Amino acid sequence: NLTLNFGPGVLRLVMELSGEMVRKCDPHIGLLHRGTEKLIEYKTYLQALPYFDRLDYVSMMCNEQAYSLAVEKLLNIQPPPRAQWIRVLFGEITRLLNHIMAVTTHALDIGAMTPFFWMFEEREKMFEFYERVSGARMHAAYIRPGGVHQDLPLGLLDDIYEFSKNFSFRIDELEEMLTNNRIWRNRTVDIGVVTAEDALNYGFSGVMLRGSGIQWDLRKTQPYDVYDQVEFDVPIGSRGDCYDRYLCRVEEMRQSLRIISQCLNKMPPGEIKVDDAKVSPPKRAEMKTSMESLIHHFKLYTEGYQVPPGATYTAIEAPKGEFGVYLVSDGSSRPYRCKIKAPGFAHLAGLDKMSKGHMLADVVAIIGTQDIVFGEVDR
Amino acid sequence: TYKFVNMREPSMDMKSVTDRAAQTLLWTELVRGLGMTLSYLFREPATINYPFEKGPLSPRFRGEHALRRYPSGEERCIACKLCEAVCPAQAITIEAEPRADGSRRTTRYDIDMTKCIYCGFCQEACPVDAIVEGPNFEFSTETHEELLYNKEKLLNNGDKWEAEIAANIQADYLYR
Amino acid sequence: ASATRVIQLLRNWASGRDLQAKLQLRYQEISKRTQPPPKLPVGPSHKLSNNYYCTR
């Protein structure tokens, strides 16, 4: 029984091995703890928004949407329909990006390196969509607690449709390279098997729950923006191993394509942010023409809007699981407390149980199938 | 509605068993993967010839910060300090006083580019379009000190990039 | 794509599908980089009367 340290995403991992078996797996985290939750307390809500881009930095607009929903619930306002449709469309695009990153990185760690490039070309195209809509490729900060910052450019929808009509073939190529390969199945089948009750008690969410046969999805059971107006299927696993989670993620990519099609065909007209200048800033022309608009712009960009006192816990179906925010307001324009809930935290906490009686090479597969990004884990 | 991903039961008749045995012994799926890689080998790569070719960009895209001025030549900034107040990273430092002609102008306008997050909140908070985040992104530096911009550097950046900055603003100002 | 017919058939047989139907490199089918000006309508609270803020 020898103890060895896999030092430095960035992870320190302490194990004791009995030959090839993994006996204890003690992950050491905090190598990316930047004190985001304490820094948020010194910012206004608009100022605190860009932290959520950096929390789970593979799914940026999903964290933006979760924070915006929490602030909207505390403010007792609602975004316009077009803003909600844009939010859901870009959330599905973000889910596609996140699942591409997760699947290709998991394959790369095992030893399959070519689909990484194949699908990072598509990732670059989606980054182009992000840049066109917001001016930034990755740390977008586009989704706001009143809606979205800017309306879509006049040719974005056509390019999104053009991208979406060719992505299924890329998924097909990935499946041809991975799904029926016997080496991939030997690396993934019956690895990291977790029971439904254990997953529930360990705090798992998302694919980590659905691969064990638990029929749960926050977009279906607790819909938030317009998710009750779109139709899609929830992939369900049967064995609770890495292979079932891989299949579930591929199926979620296909269903995200389906939802993107529905969103493109049903984009409504109207404004993009709540028509309430005490929360959402006015237009530039109004600010440069009307006295009230200039006053409200000044106050919103210097002090920010005040949020009525209260505490809420708002969760969404993030591409990695249930992403939640426990937001506390004291009545001022700065949040009193902001606790950030990341599914990767619970998944990494369960990594120890998931790796009992497995090879040293299986822990890498379990880490890859858990979809761990340490920005959200450490915060 | 929900879907099953791994709920297929293999057939147990002699033909399907023989097919699976042939797959196991003759390595059919590995040949399929080899064929997929071979098919990718014969298509045009997605590589562009940097730096001679450039990646597509948009007017909205945020680049290096610049201080603009009116067509008459006077700087637009009036030292309202709204960008400094809104800056989520506290990257902007501003000091001001009345000018020799009594105008409200800055004497210090510093942006720490190693603290900036390039969010663009400052340019959307500015009421006179004085501070903008221009399209330049190739401004890497050999030392930390040259990334600490003062007012002279930002005014020089504005005078250097004004043509493209104004074109981008003309393209994008109807969405703001 | 500027690919010869023989290479086209070879890659089609190797992958087992029709690739020219769905190409992964953009071409003239994308939108123009210069676009007409938009209009961006206003919200429901842009009325000149019966629009007191206390009711919204």
């Binding site: 450019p153 449709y161 009509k165 097909d172 | - | 087992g16 000006p37 209009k39 309508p41």
Partner: peptide, 29 residues
Amino acid sequence: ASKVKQDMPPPGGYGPIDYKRNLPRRGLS
């Protein structure tokens, strides 16, 4: 005078988007 102009789907909507898995069977018994 000028009417509203923003990014909208074309009249009649977009064409269908393929999303189902397509892994064909080549053929050898």
